[PDB]
Design a protein around this nucleic acid. Sequence first.
DNA 1: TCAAGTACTTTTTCCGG
RNA 2: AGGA
DNA 3: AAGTACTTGA
Lengths: 268, 84, 107, 97, 557, 178, 112, 171
Amino acid sequence: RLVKALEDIMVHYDNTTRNSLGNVIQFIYGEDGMDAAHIEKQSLDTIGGSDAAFEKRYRVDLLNTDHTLDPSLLESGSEILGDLKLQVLLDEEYKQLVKDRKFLREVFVDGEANWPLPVNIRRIIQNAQQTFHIDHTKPSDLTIKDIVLGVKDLQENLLVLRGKNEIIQNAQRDAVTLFCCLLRSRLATRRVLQEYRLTKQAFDWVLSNIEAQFLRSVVHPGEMVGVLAAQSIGEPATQMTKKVTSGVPRLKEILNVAKNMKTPSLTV
Amino acid sequence: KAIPKDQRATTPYMTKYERARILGTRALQISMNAPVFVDLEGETDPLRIAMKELAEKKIPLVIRRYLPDGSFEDWSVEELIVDL
Amino acid sequence: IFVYQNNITPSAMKLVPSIPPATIETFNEAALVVNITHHELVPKHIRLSSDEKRELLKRYRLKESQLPRIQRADPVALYLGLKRGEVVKIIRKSETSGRYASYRICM
Amino acid sequence: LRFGEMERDCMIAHGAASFLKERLMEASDAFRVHICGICGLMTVIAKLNHNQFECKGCDNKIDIYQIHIPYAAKLLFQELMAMNITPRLYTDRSRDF
Amino acid sequence: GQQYSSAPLRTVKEVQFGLFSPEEVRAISVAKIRFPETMDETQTRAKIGGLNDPRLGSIDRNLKCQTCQEGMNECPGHFGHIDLAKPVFHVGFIAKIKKVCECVCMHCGKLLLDEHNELMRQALAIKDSKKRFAAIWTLCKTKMVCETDVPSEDDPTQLVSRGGCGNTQPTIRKDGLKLVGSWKKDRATGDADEPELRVLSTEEILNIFKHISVKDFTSLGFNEVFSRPEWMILTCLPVPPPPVRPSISFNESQRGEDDLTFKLADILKANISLETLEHNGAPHHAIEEAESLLQFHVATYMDNDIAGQPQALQKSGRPVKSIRARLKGKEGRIRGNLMGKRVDFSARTVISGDPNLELDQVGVPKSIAKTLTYPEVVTPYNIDRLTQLVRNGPNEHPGAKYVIRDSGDRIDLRYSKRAGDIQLQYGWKVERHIMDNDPVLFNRQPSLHKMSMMAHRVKVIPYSTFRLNLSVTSPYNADFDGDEMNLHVPQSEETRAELSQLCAVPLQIVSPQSNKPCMGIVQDTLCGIRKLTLRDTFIELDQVLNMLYWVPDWDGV
Amino acid sequence: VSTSTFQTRRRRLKKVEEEENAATLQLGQEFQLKQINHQGEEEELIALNLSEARLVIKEALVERRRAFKRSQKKTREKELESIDVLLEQTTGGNNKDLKNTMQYLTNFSRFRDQETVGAVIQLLKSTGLHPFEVAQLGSLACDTADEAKTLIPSLNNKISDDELERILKELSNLETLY
Amino acid sequence: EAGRAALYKEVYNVIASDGSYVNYRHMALLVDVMTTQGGLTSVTRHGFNRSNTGALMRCSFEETVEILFEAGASAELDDCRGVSENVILGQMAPIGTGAFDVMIDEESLVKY
Amino acid sequence: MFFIKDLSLNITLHPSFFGPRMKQYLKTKLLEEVEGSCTGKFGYILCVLDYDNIDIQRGRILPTDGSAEFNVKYRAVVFKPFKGEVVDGTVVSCSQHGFEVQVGPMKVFVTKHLMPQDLTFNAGSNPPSYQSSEDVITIKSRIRVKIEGCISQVSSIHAIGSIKEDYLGAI
DNA sequence: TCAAGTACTTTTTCCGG
RNA sequence: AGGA
DNA sequence: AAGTACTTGA
Ligand SMILES: [Mg+2]
Ligand SMILES: [Zn+2]
Ligand SMILES: [Zn+2]
Ligand SMILES: [Zn+2]
């Protein structure tokens, strides 16, 4: 039944998910427009922890002697203290990070940080480190503009929908929303410099890889997502063995849209 | 109706299916004694000849990509990116 | 809008469509004790202008058939006072994308 | 052996469109009928040798196409006809959408 | 092997469903189809100019078709006809016929409700050709009177005249293949109390339906071109050709006629009794008696498993197979012959695991490789290889079974007097044995996954089992307690590309089902991998050097 | 496989009416006044008077001989022999139809030169007559307006007898003196 | 809309209860398919199989002959867009490999 | 009469031809098929015009076989005869039944009865002739005929005609 | 006019006498 | 009547 | 094992 109901569903060349009638089922495959093969459980660091520890991790204040990036972290360090124009970029950055935190907390209400997302950023950084033999002693050759702006740029190229118009462009922004919270959380200035200790080259390479990887991760028009979905529920149903009616018989109850159900219950 | 080259908006990259069907097609054509657009550097299997043709983007084929409405965008195997 | 206590007799109900271009709505006071729109599972629905809809259809190369449907009688379709053919943009949160925008045409 | 419905599903799941066609056609059933372009039926008296085509009761000696369908489908169509249903087969479109 | 045809080859872009007009049936008909006798021209074994080939398709295998010439494999059947003595309901439409009567005037053929009723113009508005008919019926069923004058689209004082006729409409109920009404009546304003009880004849319903306006019937489901309502009532019956009802001709002088061949003879016989009965001194009851039976046979021929109990059982007890029965789900036409099919170039045996096979390979028994064949086109690249496989013949392993020339005809290397001296020409096809590294679809049923059918590299091996790498066990859900697996061989360079490029085992590693890998290290290898990787585990040089050599891609360091 | 046209008509089930073809200017479906060229534009029917037609084919075959040699790189009784040569060069021989056609047009043309066929075409396409009549007027040599109006019965009320007779005079004056 | 959310929640619960994991998208699609109609469309013969998709497609599941008889009676036109129709017709279904078309360009051919 | 018609023939080229002389092979194949052709629908397809500009378009590769299919859009000179058409032609055949007249690619036959009464068959002549008090209709003679009707036949169109009405006959 | 039983419908993994 |  | 549709008395 799951198969025969979903057979004719597939991703079209407009990233839309339609049936044999061309009736839209999903506007973008699985609300994100990604192929599930290219997805991995990743941590959204921005979501959890104390408001205090967030600040320690993410805050750069070039106008405070104890909250500036130490000149040990980057070469610019000494000439960076007090740069008001640069602080406008780090305020921009930190403001966006706090924005993300509140948004993520709206989405995942319990504060669940681990979500399946495309592009394993943890690994790109791991690999950037052995690839470039990152010296956790010497200071980076990165500018704040190099970091802040480079990340802002990479985001514009994380394409999922291509059309030149408001609807499709707003649609692209939407589809990419979460991935960028992750992106922004993992590529914040302090983080890049203090944690990853990346060089400009390492950083440029991390960025290029995220891009390439992301693009690969998108669903292929032609992908027969209907039969996939049907079988992806069908097969696990096969291996199946307060007290509410569950398992095979509840799944049965659900697909039938059974009115006179076995265990009705409210959770007040 | 046929979307103009300057108004195309489908992936600039080649889908898994496109590539599979191109290779299948060239392999079939090569196997049916069609003219080969590249030096077979000792090659004898028509699929391996096809992969060599697609490798040098020396395949004279065009993917006509139909949209749900019925319109379409034509893309050359020369122009499509092969990140697969 | 007629916010009635218990019932509106079938005699009186005959006068509801009797005065167009004006439109009339009947709401049982008890249904409105709680706002359904405020509920966890109930996302932001937005009514689209004739231009906004025309554009949505243009942008996705759609016939009205091809759009997902909201029933005229749907609790939110009633709250918003949706009429047949009117489109709602449903902006929901996503575990996948973060924010996902769906659309529904009225019945 | 049997290439059954569930096997068809996996093939559809993979997107192996040509491999699927091949299983249902070349590897099994595959047959050639001559159909009429007016009343899309298997009616055509194809005397393919003398090159005569014809579909009397259309008087159509001209507008005639050949098609490749599974013999089981040719059968199904003949069955549906025997039962007064006309599964008229057309080689062009009219609806668009 | 079908022959060249000048006709342009096209694909079915649309299927236009409809109903047969008796006129069409008569037009397309290559014969009528007058005698229940199958053949034996007065016992003389050859088809009678009456039933099966009175110009139809052909039997005998030898002896070409009488209308086209082609014969057997090439000749599709040719339809015939039988003119029915009285009109008869098509079983499948009885209720749709009833419902149409329920909607229209059984005297003038006008819709019982129209643009004057509001609820009607509301229901008429409905776009869906089925939902619109559904709403039209619920409204008009209740209307038991064809109205002459209805109140104007303003005042109930001035009643405007629509269509004529006053006539009270019968209250229709079915009595298994028969439609019987119960007209309300009048008699001193009351009556019923005891109404008019008479059965509605096929011919009267036909005549009512014939009078239903194009606009009216088009408002109901119907279409004026392909499906007019009058077509649910059968006047002229299409006779399906022998290919539909083939005679299972066991030996020479012994028939074996199909069920449908017999059921038609029944219809034909039932028709002649009625035809002669009415042309002669019509004993009027003996007529509606002979009519009812024709209605039964034409009914059971299409559908035998009817609500109204009698099951038209063949003299053998066994009930006759309906056409409906043929097409009916899982096993039979749609589901069994079309969505599923028994297929050539397929193999199946017991499966057993191999720790020495690569993940993406499949151990194929020599016998299975020696049977399954791939059609390779003689190209300058393969020309010499293929000539040797051809020379090797069908009995050696790397060999071939057939040589197909450009000139259609297929050379059987097994018997050909020229299996030795056979010079290949470019373009010819050599049907060679399945060889090491060919791509093949390997499957384990049930097939609830796309991974239950993956593409593998052939490895021809001894012993009668399909051998698989153990890590590929899980996706298929196979074990070696006596499981069996299916193997399918592609025939096109195109088809292989689909297998190798889309469904090959390594591609299938990380599945979208759960966004994680669907294959891993199992049993011995998992059990040993723990044992091997403890702090306590140390290996002497002798074994280290062997373990190193064992890695095929080892750097040599 | 045979040839198709610009006329897209959808003959769904409804076979017939295949109404008679006569010079009541009732030519085929295919030979309708409002044709459509491959560019999709509505264009009028092109009817050639044998003299006009001879020049078209000759031109086409001449330009063909040109490309055939380019791709190879890396007095009536006298026009008859000249054409018979071009056919043996450009046409696949087997086309006996074109060989007879050319000879027919060569022995039956009224106007030898392009200059001459020019003026004929102007003179006639001022009348507003249908392409068929405009051709028949150029290909059939008539003296009485009656000769013409009888042979081309379609003309009947379409032109003045005097107007037609003025045309016929000027058509005779254009007539090539072989 | 909330009907969809509960429908997923409830479906998801059956999977996670067994202790299994199915990626969101799959469950979403089923839940969405049941939902897009405007109400709850059952994954039954009297649910989905009674939509406006092609007769041959629909006839392949549960009500076969009855479906085809109705198709005839109401002169239904099969688009031939469904996988199922192409499997019945022995054609390359508009599925992955067959979701586009391949053409030879004489121009690019003479370029090489 | 004699038209210029925009037409299109679908050709199915085998892969072995997907070389540079592909357009050349296609254009040549079109002329093979189309040129010299005869339909009832279009008449005699005589000469394909503008060889240098024949529109080959893109060829769709047919799925199971490698061959590609092009719709070769072209323009040609056609000759489609009609009933009521008055035609000039030369006699060819001549018997006790009538005489056949060659008109371009087609032959129009005139029955002894579709002729005036006076013109009678004279068997005793080399070659057989028809004789009036004024005219002698024989093998080489030029005639003006009114086509009475046409019969669409395979690789031709044959027709019947009169020389009985006014302004028809010998020229 | 509407609740309740009535007719009566329909499916169910894969592969030798 | 059995097999996974 | 659970339905859709239709018909029956308050
Ligand atoms: Mg087992
Ligand atoms: Zn026909
Ligand atoms: Zn035959
Ligand atoms: Zn009436």
